Amino acid sequence: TLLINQPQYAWLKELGLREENEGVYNGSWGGRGEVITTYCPANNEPIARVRQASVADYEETVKKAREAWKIWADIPAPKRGEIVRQIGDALREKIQVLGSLVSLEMGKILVEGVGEVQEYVDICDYAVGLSRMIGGPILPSERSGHALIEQWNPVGLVGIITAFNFPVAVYGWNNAIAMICGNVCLWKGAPTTSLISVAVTKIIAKVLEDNKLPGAICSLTCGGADIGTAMAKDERVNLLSFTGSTQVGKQVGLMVQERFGRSLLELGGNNAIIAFEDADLSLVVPSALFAAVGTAGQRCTTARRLFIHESIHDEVVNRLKKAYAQIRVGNPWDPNVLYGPLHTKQAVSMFLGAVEEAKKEGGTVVYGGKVMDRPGNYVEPTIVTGLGHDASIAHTGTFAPILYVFKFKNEEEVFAWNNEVKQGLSSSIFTKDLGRIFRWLGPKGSDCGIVNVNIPTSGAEIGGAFGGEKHTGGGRESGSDAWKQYMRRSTCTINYSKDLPLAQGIKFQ
Amino acid sequence: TLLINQPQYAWLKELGLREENEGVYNGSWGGRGEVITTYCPANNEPIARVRQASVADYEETVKKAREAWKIWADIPAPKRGEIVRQIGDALREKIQVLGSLVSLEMGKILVEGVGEVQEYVDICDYAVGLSRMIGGPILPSERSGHALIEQWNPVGLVGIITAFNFPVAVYGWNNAIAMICGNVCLWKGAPTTSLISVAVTKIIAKVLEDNKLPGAICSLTCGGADIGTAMAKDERVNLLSFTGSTQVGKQVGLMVQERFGRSLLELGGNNAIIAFEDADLSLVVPSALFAAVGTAGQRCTTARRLFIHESIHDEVVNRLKKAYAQIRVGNPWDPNVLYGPLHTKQAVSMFLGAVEEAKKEGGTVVYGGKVMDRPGNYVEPTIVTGLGHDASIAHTGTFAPILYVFKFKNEEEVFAWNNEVKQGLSSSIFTKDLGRIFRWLGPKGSDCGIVNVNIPTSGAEIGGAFGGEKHTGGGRESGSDAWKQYMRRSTCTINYSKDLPLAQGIKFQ
Amino acid sequence: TLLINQPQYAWLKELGLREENEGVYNGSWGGRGEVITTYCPANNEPIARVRQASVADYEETVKKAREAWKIWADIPAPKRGEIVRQIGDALREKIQVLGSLVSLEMGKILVEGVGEVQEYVDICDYAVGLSRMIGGPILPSERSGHALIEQWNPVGLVGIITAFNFPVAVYGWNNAIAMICGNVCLWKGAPTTSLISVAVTKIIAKVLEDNKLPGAICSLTCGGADIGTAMAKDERVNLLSFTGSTQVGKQVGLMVQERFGRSLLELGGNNAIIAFEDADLSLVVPSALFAAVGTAGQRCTTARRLFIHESIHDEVVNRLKKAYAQIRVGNPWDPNVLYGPLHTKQAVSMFLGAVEEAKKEGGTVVYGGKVMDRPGNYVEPTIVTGLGHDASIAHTGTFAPILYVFKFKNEEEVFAWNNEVKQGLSSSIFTKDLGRIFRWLGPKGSDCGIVNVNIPTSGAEIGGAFGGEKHTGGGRESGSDAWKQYMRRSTCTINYSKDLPLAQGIKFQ
Amino acid sequence: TLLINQPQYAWLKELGLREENEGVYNGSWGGRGEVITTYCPANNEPIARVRQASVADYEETVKKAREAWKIWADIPAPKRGEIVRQIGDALREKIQVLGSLVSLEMGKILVEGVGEVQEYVDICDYAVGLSRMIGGPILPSERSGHALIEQWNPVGLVGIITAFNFPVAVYGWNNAIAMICGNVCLWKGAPTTSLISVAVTKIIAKVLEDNKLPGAICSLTCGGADIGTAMAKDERVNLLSFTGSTQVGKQVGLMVQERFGRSLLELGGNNAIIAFEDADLSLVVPSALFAAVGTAGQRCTTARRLFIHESIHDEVVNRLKKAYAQIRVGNPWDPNVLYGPLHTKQAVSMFLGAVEEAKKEGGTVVYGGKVMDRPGNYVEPTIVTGLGHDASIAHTGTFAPILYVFKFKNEEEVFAWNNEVKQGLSSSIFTKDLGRIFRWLGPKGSDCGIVNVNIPTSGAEIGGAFGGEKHTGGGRESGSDAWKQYMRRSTCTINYSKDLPLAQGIKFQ
């Protein structure tokens, strides 16, 4: 019955996966919690099983992780980069089979499953050089005979909670950066992508053990809300990096603040594309389509709100409808497929609720809107017109492939409409107007963490920091100086002079 | 009866103070809230009155500040720096009379009151140059025909809540930095330093008004917990900088997190000096004394825990006793005075409670411990020996001039003893050992935000970032890249090429 | 006969100038060299006299500056910034009378003379904050128990040779930055602006003396080529900043390279404005005029080559002619005057030589070309059309107010024509095309040190580094990290561990 | 007779080396110049031959390299980093045989031959991340509606001349950095390491060819002074990096300055180790030996001057003598060998002349001083005592393993003695004194480019910039922001507003 027991999926064994897999790694493999079976969202068939972490597994893992940190924090950062460099190579050696697992267990198409593994590889190669660069300035002290230096040190144990939709890359950004910064890591991925978490951890565990390093440096405790909540409340998790929904992320943020911990929050987006009258429409339509239906609309950066100037609204909507009609739906591993299943059956149900609610709020479905009658969690990519920019279903957002299209007339109102939602991840304008572009980049422009021009809302590379504002949580991952979130700053004054302080009337000896 | 009506305090009128003063400024002065009288702690006499903010005052002020932000955010940062430079000069012209007000209403000695105003002047002079430098890198994009830029923009309204012990400088750090970053400010100072808040605001308002700028750029709403709590809950307050107690800061931090706002928390310290056997005692003893008794022990960075190696414990304590007996006590504006009153009568009672509590935990008062027989809130600077480092009064502690002395033997235990308290603001070792110094600065060393060598726990200048870790709250002020907390980062990809996305098998028009 | 003895120029005495002035300052004032009389180019009247430096004056000044450096380099950089802050204020208090001297002795119009002093004022305020920021990173060593830090220290004595056309700002840029970096300075200005050099030095000398500092920190030795050549060959001159002609700068660079000194070269520019077809002509025409005729065409960044697309060439040229006809010529201090005299009588002769040579080389003078029949060195601002882009008089380029206008058709040829001259200082395109704008800024765009869009060739502020490439010499002044040219970098590894090296088979003791 | 034709050296063929090799690579292999035979300095046996570049070869190669630059500069820097990463892997794969070739042709021992290749590997891995970081800041303009950006673009063609002693690493440092910065390279190695140059170039060429890139991006023209001189005078060589003698580097710098090109000069060192009385002798003695005799004393960073405090001079010298006697001499590829031959017989004659001159100048040879009676260019590592610190042979300095030992008493004089030589590369103090250490790093300390503490003069890693001051030439390679020497800075102002310049009275259309 299990896909891994069928000969056509024998490649799963290339990742060291078997029928039932240990979901706890801390130098040793184990798992005394509930045994979870994950299913292929393309056909609802069970893949294989993972033994999740019990409470005792978590406790023992946190303790071993903190013990491992004593060794890890003493290793010079450039030599930690060498370990990350070898992780990058180990992922490279398995990039095809690992991407296939992503397409199989998570459900995105092969080029994106592979693309996600590549993203992890790239942040490793980036981190190798960064491991020779992290630090702070020596500043000129105002005091004679004094040195003033800014030092950066690891926070210690970095808990990393990741979500289903990017079950490799998000962890990889957190892991590569946290590691070169001298932290040990504890990963709790999404339960429905447990095999992916196990397969990644198996790849990292081999690198650590080959270098005779304690495996708890990159610990794994598979589990659900119970393990994630424990991490949020655990004073031993110095930094908790959380990627997931705003609702859960809000509670995580509060629990970490309650104990004066650090949180790095990467939550939802309600991302807008704005097409102005002067836009290259041959650029708008494909950019809008791919940003909306890519990954079955399940990216944090998915385009969910399409603002079109009134003069070109009907043309762009008509051109999208005809282009939507050609989206090729199928099994995500089939090479010609552009559009795969939603991750869960619950997501299918939420999609239907959103479509029907959008109809109740006055919207018109001009394309899609129905569940597809076929095995798996397939729904039609959908376009909804006629809603006001402030319609409730547009503000709350769903994680469904539904593109809400709005009209606008002038720049000032649509910048505000971009900014009026609670989320603040990504944003894009399509225009040729030089001044409009820089106003968009300015203080009266987009309020998001990613502010794009003539590229859709999913345009981001590892060189920059990734994250958003407002209800997106404020955290940043990957590039620029995002590494400082994984370290603690100290401002250090060293008196190296023989100067004694002024006595101020006091007679010392 | 009011000091401002007595001819010997006529200099107060040089700050624009009157018998009853308006405690709300938003371009206009007002205040419909409760009228508070503030008192001089050196003689327990009332100084003058301040009309605090009502709820309606607060509402009107927030609205005016946000309206003013539209004007202020359009002013180029270098020109915002010119405004800050002129504030620097306006404070210069008033440094003596303003510092005298700090001594009178707060109670610290004159050189420290003047010194606090100098810090505001210095951070202004720093911000002038910074206003031509703030921003992010242009990064090399991996995509041909694309630019990748990291932009920084103001968050909007920066609420600034400050405490009694530094009623000028903490505001000044936030104000100077937030202003050049294009933010408007809302100040709620400690109720018992209301005259200081008003006088500072009077100086800034003239500069703003002299430059034909809306005064709400630097708003003031005098008030207590009710106004501060409103700021913590106010979604219109984009950044809340809070300086105060750990108990309050924790609730403030939770409230800001509840609404996905930004907070900058500068909370309590329980700071330690560690003297190793090789230390220069002619440097340890004065450094310990001045760091312990300065500001009557009411600094966030006041030295509260003195660890002395067993070989020199008795000698260092004996040398401290002889030096403490020579501390000159008096009115804080008297120039010969090194030691002034505690800020309130309640603090005197708490001082007595702490001394009595230290005796209950097994401690020995080797110097001081009693209230002084004189008008005002004067208590003897006190030294306590014999407690274990894990004694309850040592780990929590009060805001009293009580120095707890401990013995230690080896380096690792005393580093851990430094780190074992909940707070993490400042820390100092005195030693000549080169390796011990770098280990202190390293990952197994001090866990504090300020990590000093051969200078006590109050060694800090504006060039570096100021703040602590753990229950100190994690915020940073003043130097390095602390300005990024007052701005929002965006990662911006600009497609300037004529290239189109790949069709991926779809026919576009 | 001297202007300083006439009552209408009595304001000169406000700068401490007299009939005959000492041109050597090294803590004391002197001058045993040749006495020079400087003349007002607006009427050819002599202004006053300056006693220049003899060899012995130079020898003594260098020795005292190097002695003073021992004191100056021990002063903390933020405290050096405080001195630079006071210099800015001392310049502020005299901005009007000093800017007037620039107009009288050099000949540019009053708002530009005043503006030049403001440039020095602004760089001082910038350097104040910079003096708390200069330094390098603490890097993570690959070796255990080692620290790796990059240190910056002053080079020592910075010789600053400046030119007539910016007789205040160029020195100021060098001075304020070299000073906060811990260097002493030796200034030799253009002989024909000796009074300006003396007047500036008097303002600085007062600030140094008021702060109880050796005056030689900002030394002055007025002189011509003989002193400049001595500075270029002087091993005691650690950095030579030379601003002037390409011909002279080339010999200075070679002499400094011969002795392994450091040089900072700010040489000629042959700057082009390029107007594309989609450009706002209501922006092109005023911008071109002001950048070409401003300062009577005697700026390093003066627009000398105007490339106009063939479609709009005749319209732009005709609008340029009609606009030149409204330029108001007069005494440079007289209000509403836009156009003053050339600096010298030789410059008039070179203007005439260039005009006739352009005619012989196939050019047509469509406006101006003649000396004006009036007192002073006034020549008509001139427009020459019809030359090929590679005309010899266009490539060499005099310092005369002649604007050479060319046609172009496509982007690639006109970028190449911008880059085809030996100089590489300033450059501008006027266009609305987003892609052209970024191609102009990229590796196939402008090759100059200043690359502007929709603003002329004189657009430059202190926040950025100022200087050019190719025959402009490569130096940078003012903003960004130009300060590193005034300091020496050291890469410092500190072994703080007790770890002994690997014995590698040797029996050590 | 040629070593490559003997079967024991068949491993040379693994690098693509044959009996006669092409010494020109520009996408094709050739060489019409004189054929040079290189010899093994351990036995003076011929290895193989290399056909060097004629003038026509050089011309053709520069032209193809400049054509290739048009393709190379358009490739996004991260993608250039991907090429550099593969060069690193390709070096990894050949590290043993290439290290053996370095030991065979140059004469250093195998671990250092492998170590030199490893250094190139490391700079590649460093440059991979750096290729996502190079760039400049976005600055806040003082003009509303304007952007201010600092751009960095390649210089174009980077000429790289390297020396015999580091025939891989120096090229690799320049190559990896120049490539990610968008430049093409032209390499002319030392004639006596021609096989190494060819072998390295073969490794790079395969990577470029596999990636369908023009091979002239990493061009090679083997030759001596004539080709090196051609590069120095060639306006087509935008940056000439020269590593070699001070005498030649001085002429190269002058030739480049004459044509207003860029040079990066890495010339000789005359480096000092200073042992204070408080130094750990168990650390001084091995450190001095390895820094003095490593690479048979042929590094730029070789310890040539050992200053010992009077109190410990005799003990250190005696401990140095006992350790020198254990230095194991042999063929540089022979296992466990610490000490190989000098590179040439001429170096042996210079060694002998220096020893006799040092004795004639009053020095005593306490160990070594003689040619070894065996095949190859073997001389005894030598220690000379009794000379004054300013003895003539100590200031000039050969490239021979002769360690000059001097006495000192006080810190200030021996600091001055470190600084008194013309060169200024590396320097080290061995001490435990905290204040002395910071004074050594400060403005009155070492004047060298590398300023070390308790680690000898060869302590340098790629994370920092490498190079010296004074007669060492001032260039920096490898770490920090050394990449900026391989790029040109532009300060770019973009007016994105519709604002027009002030009419200044002129009526425009």
Side-chain angles (χ1 to χ4, degrees), chain C residues 142 326 461 465 480, chain D residues 141-142 150 326 461 491:
Chain C
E142 71 186 45
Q326 300 173 62
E461 47 194 295
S480 196
Chain D
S141 175
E142 71 185 46
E150 180 176 281
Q326 301 171 63
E461 48 193 294
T491 304

Side-chain angles (χ1 to χ4, degrees), chain A residues 209-231:
Chain A
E209 292 167 10
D210 284 350
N211 292 271
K212 285 123 199 175
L213 291 171
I217 290 166
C218 298
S219 292
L220 170 72
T221 57
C222 284
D226 64 322
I227 294 285
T229 288
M231 290 167 68

Side-chain angles (χ1 to χ4, degrees), chain C residues 173-321 323-335 337-345 347-359 361-369 371-395 397 399-408 410-411 413-497 499-501 503-505:
Chain C
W173 288 343
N174 284 274
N175 169 259
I177 296 299
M179 276 191 73
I180 65 149
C181 291
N183 306 285
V184 295
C185 304
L186 173 60
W187 187 15
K188 189 215 78 61
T192 50
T193 59
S194 288
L195 293 175
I196 288 155
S197 300
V198 167
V200 171
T201 303
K202 280 170 171 301
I203 294 169
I204 293 163
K206 177 72 165 14
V207 171
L208 291 179
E209 292 169 9
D210 281 352
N211 288 268
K212 297 194 166 182
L213 290 170
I217 296 165
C218 300
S219 293
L220 171 74
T221 58
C222 286
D226 53 15
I227 293 285
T229 288
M231 290 162 70
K233 299 180 158 194
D234 196 340
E235 281 180 39
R236 296 163 307 183
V237 176
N238 301 96
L239 167 65
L240 185 50
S241 169
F242 173 91
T243 296
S245 72
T246 286
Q247 209 197 29
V248 176
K250 174 175 157 182
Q251 298 318 303
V252 166
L254 288 171
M255 293 186 251
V256 174
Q257 182 67 56
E258 163 71 29
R259 62 173 170 88
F260 281 117
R262 291 177 179 208
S263 67
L264 195 167
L265 302 182
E266 297 266 346
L267 313 180
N270 190 359
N271 316 286
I273 291 173
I274 305 170
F276 283 83
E277 194 185 348
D278 69 333
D280 182 359
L281 296 193
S282 304
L283 177 71
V284 167
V285 178
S287 300
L289 181 145
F290 294 132
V293 313
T295 324
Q298 304 171 112
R299 321 185 172 125
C300 310
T301 58
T302 285
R304 313 215 178 271
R305 302 181 291 143
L306 179 56
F307 294 88
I308 315 171
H309 192 269
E310 57 188 14
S311 64
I312 56 162
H313 169 273
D314 291 0
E315 178 184 350
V316 175
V317 170
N318 286 328
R319 281 163 76 160
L320 216 38
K321 281 166 55 186
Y324 266 54
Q326 300 173 62
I327 297 172
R328 297 181 304 281
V329 180
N331 290 330
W333 55 88
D334 278 349
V337 171
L338 301 171
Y339 188 80
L342 303 187
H343 182 59
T344 63
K345 279 180 191 203
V348 171
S349 189
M350 302 250 97
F351 163 83
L352 278 178
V355 169
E356 291 297 328
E357 178 60 21
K359 290 187 210 160
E361 292 185 18
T364 304
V365 176
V366 299
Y367 184 101
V371 181
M372 303 181 180
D373 180 38
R374 65 185 293 153
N377 315 328
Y378 289 85
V379 305
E380 292 171 336
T382 304
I383 309 172
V384 175
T385 57
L387 286 178
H389 68 87
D390 53 357
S392 173
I393 194 71
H395 273 236
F399 217 55
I402 302 171
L403 184 64
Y404 301 98
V405 179
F406 310 101
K407 297 175 191 178
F408 76 93
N410 55 82
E411 171 185 316
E413 70 185 350
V414 76
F415 284 13
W417 297 350
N418 177 83
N419 295 344
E420 76 182 341
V421 297
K422 297 271 202 37
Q423 286 127 321
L425 180 47
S426 197
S427 61
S428 298
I429 61 164
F430 286 75
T431 190
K432 301 172 173 164
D433 188 284
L434 178 62
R436 176 177 297 143
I437 289 166
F438 279 97
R439 289 192 298 274
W440 177 242
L441 301 170
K444 314 301 183 62
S446 176
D447 65 3
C448 293
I450 300 163
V451 180
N452 289 344
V453 170
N454 290 329
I455 158 173
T457 49
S458 305
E461 47 194 295
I462 62 157
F466 178 87
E469 293 304 305
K470 302 149 65 185
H471 285 43
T472 305
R476 290 302 188 278
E477 294 160 326
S478 187
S480 196
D481 68 346
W483 61 263
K484 292 167 179 171
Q485 293 161 108
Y486 302 80
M487 304 194 75
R488 60 175 175 86
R489 179 208 312 257
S490 57
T491 303
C492 316
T493 304
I494 300 173
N495 167 24
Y496 59 83
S497 78
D499 281 339
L500 272 20
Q504 296 182 61

Side-chain angles (χ1 to χ4, degrees), chain B residues 180-211 213-246 248-333 335-397 399-408 410-411 413-472:
Chain B
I180 64 151
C181 289
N183 305 283
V184 292
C185 302
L186 176 63
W187 189 13
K188 191 214 80 63
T192 52
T193 61
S194 288
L195 296 175
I196 287 156
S197 299
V198 171
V200 169
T201 301
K202 278 170 171 300
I203 292 170
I204 293 163
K206 181 177 170 301
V207 170
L208 293 177
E209 291 169 10
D210 283 353
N211 291 273
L213 289 174
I217 294 165
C218 299
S219 291
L220 167 71
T221 55
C222 285
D226 53 357
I227 293 286
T229 288
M231 292 164 70
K233 297 178 157 30
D234 195 339
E235 282 183 82
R236 296 164 307 183
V237 174
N238 304 97
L239 166 64
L240 184 51
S241 175
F242 177 97
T243 296
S245 67
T246 296
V248 177
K250 174 173 158 180
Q251 297 316 301
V252 163
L254 283 172
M255 293 183 249
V256 175
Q257 182 67 58
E258 157 70 28
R259 59 173 171 88
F260 279 114
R262 290 179 177 209
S263 70
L264 193 166
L265 301 181
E266 296 266 348
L267 313 181
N270 187 0
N271 316 288
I273 293 174
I274 306 170
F276 282 82
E277 178 165 359
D278 69 333
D280 182 359
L281 296 195
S282 306
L283 174 69
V284 167
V285 174
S287 299
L289 179 145
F290 294 129
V293 313
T295 323
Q298 304 170 113
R299 318 180 170 151
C300 309
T301 62
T302 287
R304 312 215 176 272
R305 300 181 287 142
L306 174 54
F307 295 94
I308 316 170
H309 187 269
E310 283 178 348
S311 66
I312 53 165
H313 170 273
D314 289 355
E315 180 184 350
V316 170
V317 168
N318 191 242
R319 282 165 79 159
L320 276 170
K321 280 165 54 185
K322 297 197 302 159
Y324 265 54
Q326 298 169 61
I327 293 173
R328 295 178 176 162
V329 178
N331 287 330
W333 51 90
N336 276 274
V337 174
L338 302 175
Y339 187 81
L342 302 184
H343 184 58
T344 64
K345 303 192 184 169
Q346 184 178 343
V348 174
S349 188
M350 295 188 292
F351 162 82
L352 282 178
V355 169
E356 179 60 21
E357 177 60 23
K359 291 187 210 160
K360 288 181 184 176
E361 293 182 18
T364 302
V365 176
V366 301
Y367 184 85
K370 315 151 227 96
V371 183
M372 303 182 65
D373 170 60
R374 68 185 297 156
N377 311 329
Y378 290 94
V379 309
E380 291 173 335
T382 301
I383 309 172
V384 174
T385 62
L387 286 176
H389 67 86
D390 51 358
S392 305
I393 192 72
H395 273 212
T396 351
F399 218 51
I402 303 171
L403 182 58
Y404 303 101
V405 179
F406 309 94
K407 296 177 193 177
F408 75 98
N410 53 83
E411 172 182 315
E413 69 184 349
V414 75
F415 284 11
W417 294 349
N418 177 84
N419 293 338
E420 76 184 342
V421 298
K422 292 163 161 72
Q423 309 102 314
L425 181 49
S426 197
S427 62
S428 298
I429 63 165
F430 287 76
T431 190
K432 304 171 175 294
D433 188 286
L434 179 61
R436 177 177 297 142
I437 287 167
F438 280 95
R439 290 192 297 276
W440 175 242
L441 299 169
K444 316 302 184 63
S446 176
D447 65 3
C448 293
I450 299 166
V451 179
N452 287 344
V453 172
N454 292 329
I455 164 173
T457 49
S458 304
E461 48 193 295
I462 60 156
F466 179 95
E469 295 305 306
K470 301 148 63 186
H471 287 216
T472 305

Side-chain angles (χ1 to χ4, degrees), chain A residues 70 141-142 150 250 262 326 444 449 453 461 465 469 476 480-481 484 489 491 493 495, chain B residues 70 141-142 150 258 262 326 444 449 453-454 461 465 469 476 480-481 484 489 491 493 495:
Chain A
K70 294 186 193 181
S141 174
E142 71 185 45
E150 177 176 279
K250 176 173 160 179
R262 293 180 179 210
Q326 298 171 61
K444 313 300 183 62
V453 173
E461 46 193 293
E469 294 306 307
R476 291 301 190 277
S480 193
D481 64 342
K484 292 166 177 170
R489 179 210 313 257
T491 304
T493 302
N495 170 27
Chain B
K70 297 188 192 183
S141 177
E142 68 184 45
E150 177 179 278
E258 157 70 28
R262 290 179 177 209
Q326 298 169 61
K444 316 302 184 63
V453 172
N454 292 329
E461 48 193 295
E469 295 305 306
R476 290 301 188 278
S480 196
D481 65 343
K484 294 168 177 171
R489 177 209 313 257
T491 304
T493 302
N495 169 26

Side-chain angles (χ1 to χ4, degrees), chain A residues 18 22-24 52 70 114 121 123 148 151 153 157 172 230 239 304 321 392 396 420-421 458 460 492:
Chain A
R18 65 195 188 285
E22 289 99 327
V24 179
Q52 291 167 120
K70 294 186 193 181
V114 166
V121 172
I123 189 58
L148 176 62
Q151 276 276 314
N153 283 295
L157 171 53
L239 166 64
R304 313 216 178 271
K321 281 165 53 186
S392 304
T396 308
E420 76 188 344
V421 298
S458 305
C492 313

